[PDB]
Amino acid sequence: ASTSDAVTFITYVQSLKRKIKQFEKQVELYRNGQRLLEKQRFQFPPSW
Amino acid sequence: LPSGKNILVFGEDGSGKTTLMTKLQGAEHGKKGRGLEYLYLSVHDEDRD
Incomplete structure (x- = not known):
């Protein structure tokens, strides 16, 4: 409701928009890593 | 992938299901x-x- 709160929400939205590309890069990295760890049989750590 | 049995085609005769x-x-x-x-x-x- 407040102007400062609206500006904070807008800043959060802008940060999410800026980090959308980083999140897509992380998603691609996760997909490639899941494929590689599966293919090589590199078993995940039990606590991992 | 697992192992174990596969499709048992308990079909009919003469239809050539083996070919299929x-x-x-x-x-x-x-x-x-x-x-x-x-x-x-x-x-x-x-x-x-």
Whole structure:
């Protein structure tokens, strides 16, 4: 409701928009890593 | 992938179901003898090699 709160929400939205590309890069990295760890049989750590 | 039994085509006679599953296995042979006849239904998955 407040102007400062609206500006904070807008800043959060802008940060999410800026980090959308980083999140897509992380998603691609996760997909490639899941494929590689599966293919090589590199078993995940039990606590991992 | 797991192992274990595969489709048992408890079908009819003369229809050449052996040929059908043969083409389904990449082969071409409907030459049935008598009784059962086991064919290795190959399955290659590139999801995890």
